[PDB]
Design a protein around this ligand. Structure first.
Ligand SMILES: Cc1cc2nc3c(=O)[nH]c(=O)nc-3n(C[C@H](O)[C@H](O)[C@H](O)COP(=O)(O)OP(=O)(O)OC[C@H]3O[C@@H](n4cnc5c(N)ncnc54)[C@H](O)[C@@H]3O)c2cc1C
Ligand SMILES: Cc1cc2nc3c(=O)[nH]c(=O)nc-3n(C[C@H](O)[C@H](O)[C@H](O)COP(=O)(O)OP(=O)(O)OC[C@H]3O[C@@H](n4cnc5c(N)ncnc54)[C@H](O)[C@@H]3O)c2cc1C
Ligand SMILES: COc1ccc(NC(=O)CN)cc1
Lengths: 587, 586
């Protein structure tokens, strides 16, 4: 048991010190490393349960039973007296820095998971390189370090959500007594794009400063893993070279798909382009029905766009479909137009006016599911039909990393690939939820297991979401259909209720459009299987309940907790209408 | 053991059926009972783990062992066949209205807790009356059915907070691309009050309609308990009479205090007057430092008022004091002036202009704790120096209801007072968190124990709160100083971090929002307190109150993933300790 663990820890760690909080001979050696500015992991043996057993099992490497013991890259360096002799004789710097490869860790991908892994590893003395490179979009769009969320995903889209929400705040302000007249106020797209971009620029810079102050090498280069320990890099002059690393982490993420139809790549755009577009999109057609499509369609309408969404079959495939539909009914009622059961077949009538900063004009041809024909003009056309990786760019097939039928890396539950020194994290890890906090947790936790002796794994179950559509949708756990299909209709009870935010009363907003429900399993103490809420601030509402769900909350737990008044969330502490009872859920 | 539960359930219930979901004789009786529109409790014996043992105990009352068994106010009515006989003979309607008293229940007090008990009790057949009367304030302000929260508390003051917040939403809009100019925009107090008052009116009406539809008697009169079962009522014409009830629930709430200084009652107002005021307060002095004081001073400043708060000693006594100071710093940095360590010793310079709709003018004199003198002019002086009950106005001293030193009712953990048919709920129940959702839960759960045999008690531990100051403050559990006092500094670890909402980056402060977790080293690092200052602090906090209730630890917070981008997600990655001395800024 403990012998399997200590073997792999000592082999994997770069510099690791087995210590005791009390022993002043360990304090002496801690301070010497600190003075020499040598980073390392520590393992305080007095603070562990099998702590005493490890000390005796440590003698198998060192032939001593005592603390401290210093290892460097799988090799015993010495006790307190031996480490101090190396220090006095100016030999210690040479011992720690000498390695089989160039780096202990090479990270391919400077995104959410990738930067998180890098900094964490560097805290234990691992010598780390982070590679990042942004291949331009078909029209040339490029951005800086930090990944997809930072430059063209969560961060820019939510700020554009917020500009869109602020419009209803000016609508509301009159009813609450302010003297503005929302009718005579307009929106400037380029002004907003400049503020979003000025903030994205502060995060690019902050990531470079962070990497530098952890002594991480940052190479803006395209990386390719040609052998288990060899990464070939092509820099921005196309200078090719090769570096070696002990552990390898792949964190290269995904990029948007285009449909295989004429005009799409030539005349359309994706989210990658939307967030630094120099001109207002104008009359827009969004093709797709994922959360990217609905979210992007949502803020454009709220900034005064004439928006249409073309839907192949359903909205938010893979989400609870009752909720998905309520999200879409709200959009259709508040300015978004839907062309349902419809696909595209894209002609250019005007070129983008790059000097004057005006969109072009395009003609979209398609057909509906029955047979009827679609044809309409649009100034901008956005595709949101899913994302994919292209590991063939990243990974030579001769290395022997196994991929699945979607193009994603098959890992074990500790992120290990089929090559024992190669791991994958984030969106390219097959089967895992594709969310930025998941990538960050995975990368951080793997760094500790590789260099600090940690054994904790990332829990991928019951991770909560939020779709930032004009009315938001938070969730944690199973959809209603998924629970029913898994356990049987007669074993599921559902508690639901409409509600109305108190901030909507004076504003004369809708009475029975916000909604929530608890999906529960009767034969398991009425355990909460999923939580769902459509309303404002849905992410702040949902997040706290994810801890309780993680802990196995029951309906009785929600019941005996007392609500905070007046809030939207408190409606969860008093649910009581069931679906089976037939009673209406309206306020 | 089980026998003492049944004897107490059959004695208080008004109409109760003992049943089995399986039995078709039980179904037959059920069908008759609400064909006649007779409300009743039902106890399905095959869903209670000791339904066998209970059925045997029933015979001590009924001489029979089978189901269905129906009782009315403690007397056994009959089995299946006996009730059906009574039906076809037109006798059953008169059995169920047999009572020693006018009402199965009388609630004195028509607010958060009182309305909640009354509706729920009526659901199981209990003949119920709810009493509500609103004594005028010194200037004569009065309002309608629903209590303090609905009329002069949570509801109106949060609507006014929302009006304060929209001001910063207007400022933020320019930075996000909108064409307005915030400096050319002002606020209309009376437009706002009309909207708030319209909503409050629709709440008054909804509560009246709700009581009607549950067959509850609403008497707009002032009640006084003269004996355990006798309630003296005085109606709007000063007519006096007496009604009797079996059970009594006191739920009369509290009212604002005034300081005993000259001019306070004559020339000042309280929150009781603020939310229906015809004129904008104007330059305002706020006296006190409770959450009412700070909340009210907060939105007045955001609507363009010139606001000073006079603080006797500290802010928010009783809450975590690190958080109190941060709440006040933000207010001082965004408009609100503070006169600290200072009390008032009120002379009137202008009478309120009732025609043109304008405030008067006042002269406040006071002193700081060092002796130095205070003297300044204001248009409106608001007193927020606490609240209190006045039970010598509900409750003859001879009834035998014991009160504590502050005049609140001393109750067992099941809301029973010292007279065994009389109960107290809400703000007048000594020692209990004074909050509306606590009043509501206490009332509903007591109704179920009295008329439907339930046994669940109200759990008053770890109830979370939110202070709706211009930057909000949500909490659940122990403060940091309290945690340290109970367990000692060495057994307490505190994780904390600053943060900045994403909504704030484009609108241009970096390190004002703050959160911490107060944990216990020896109990697996249990979470003893959660604290967060920032926007939507109530939506943020609520969900965590469920996990705390279940006994959450630092490791439970760590294994849950965040939702990005949100403020709340910052709780799932805390790692800097106060011990470490490391800075919590970002
Ligand atoms: C429009 C949109 C909105 C989203 N909104 C949210 C949201 O609100 N919340 C949320 O949780 N998630 C959101 N996501 C998803 C989230 O952004 C991703 O799950 C997250 O970015 C994945 O992290 P990652 O590190 O695996 O990949 P990435 O962040 O994409 O990092 C990969 C990086 O590596 C680079 N790279 C690729 N190949 C190579 C190579 N060969 N050599 C060197 N560098 C290379 C890429 O250029 C890129 O910068 C959104 C995604 C999109 C598209
Ligand atoms: C300014 C302010 C803001 C507040 N904000 C919040 C908040 O945001 N959240 C929160 O949870 N709590 C808040 N509170 C507290 C909340 O108002 C109380 O906790 C709650 O109203 C208590 O309910 P209750 O049923 O005990 O009493 P009440 O709701 O006050 O009802 C008691 C009723 O009894 C009536 N009455 C009194 N004597 C008699 C008599 N002799 N005969 C008949 N009727 C009588 C009174 O007129 C009153 O209507 C606030 C309080 C104030 C003052
Ligand atoms: C008695 O109910 C009220 C009705 C109206 C108001 N005031 C206004 O509408 C404008 N000051 C206040 C209380």
């Amino acid at each position: 048991g403990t012998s399997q663990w200590l073997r792999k820890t000592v082999d994997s760690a770069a510099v690791i010190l087995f210590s005791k909080t009390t022993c002043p001979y360990c304090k002496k050696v801690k301070d010497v490393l600190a003075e020499a500015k040598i980073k390392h992991a520590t393992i305080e043996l007095d603070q562990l349960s099998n702590g005493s057993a490890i000390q005796k099992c440590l003698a198998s490497f060192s032939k001593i039973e005592t603390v401290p013991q210093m290892f460097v890259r799988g090799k015993f360096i010495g006790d307190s007296q031996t480490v101090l002799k190396y220090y006095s004789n100016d030999e210690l710097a040479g011992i720690v820095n000498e390695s089989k490869y160039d780096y202990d860790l090479i990270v391919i991908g400077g995104g959410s998971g990738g930067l998180a892994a890098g900094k964490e590893a560097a805290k234990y003395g691992a010598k780390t390189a982070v590679l990042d490179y942004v291949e331009p979009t078909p029209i040339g769009t490029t951005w800086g370090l930090g990944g997809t969320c930072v430059n063209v995903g969560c961060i820019p889209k939510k700020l554009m959500h917020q500009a869109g929400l602020l419009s209803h705040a000016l609508e509301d302000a009159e009813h609450f007594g302010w003297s503005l007249d929302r009718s005579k106020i307009s929106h400037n797209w380029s002004t907003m794009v400049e503020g979003v971009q000025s903030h994205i620029g502060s995060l690019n810079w902050g990531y470079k400063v962070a990497l530098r102050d952890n002594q991480v090498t940052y190479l803006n280069a395209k990386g390719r893993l040609i052998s288990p320990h060899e990464v070939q890099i092509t820099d921005k002059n196309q200078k090719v070279s090769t570096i070696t690393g002990n552990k390898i982490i792949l964190a290269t993420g995904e990029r948007p798909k285009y449909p295989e139809i004429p005009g799409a790549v030539e005349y359309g755009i994706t989210s990658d382009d939307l967030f630094s577009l120099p001109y207002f999109p104008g009359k827009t057609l969004v093709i797709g029905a994922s959360y990217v499509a609905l979210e992007c369609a949502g803020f454009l309408a709220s900034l005064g766009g004439d928006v249409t969404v073309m839907v192949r079959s359903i909205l938010l495939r893979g989400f609870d479909q009752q909720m998905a539909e309520k999200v879409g009914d709200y959009m259709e009622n508040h300015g978004v137009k839907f062309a349902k059961l419809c696909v595209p077949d894209i002609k250019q009538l005007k070129v983008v006016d790059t000097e004057n900063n005006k969109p072009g004009l395009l003609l979209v041809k398609g057909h509906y599911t029955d047979g009827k024909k679609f044809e309409e003009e649009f100034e901008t056309v956005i595709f949101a039909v899913g994302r994919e990786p292209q590991l063939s760019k990243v990974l030579c097939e001769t290395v022997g990393v196994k991929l699945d039928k979607n193009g994603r890396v098959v890992c074990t539950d500790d992120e290990q690939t089929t090559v024992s020194n190669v791991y994958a994290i984030g969106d390219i890890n097959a089967g895992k939820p594709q969310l930025t906090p998941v990538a960050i947790q995975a990368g951080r936790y793997l760094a500790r297991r590789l260099f600090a002796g940690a054994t904790e794994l990332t829990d991928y179950s019951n991770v909560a979401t939020t779709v930032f559509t004009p009315l938001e949708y938070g969730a944690c756990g199973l959809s209603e259909e998924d629970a029913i299909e898994k356990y049987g209709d007669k074993d599921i009870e559902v508690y639901h209720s409409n509600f109305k935010p108190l901030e909507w009363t004076v504003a004369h907003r809708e009475d029975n459009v916000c909604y929530m429900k608890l999906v529960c399993r009767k034969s398991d103490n009425m355990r909460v299987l999923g939580l769902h809420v459509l309303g404002p601030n849905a992410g702040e509402i949902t997040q706290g309940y994810a801890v309780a769900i993680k802990m196995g909350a029951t309906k009785a737990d929600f019941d005996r907790t007392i609500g905070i008044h007046p809030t939207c969330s408190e409606t969860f502490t008093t649910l009581h209408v069931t679906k089976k009872s037939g009673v209406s859920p309206i306020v």
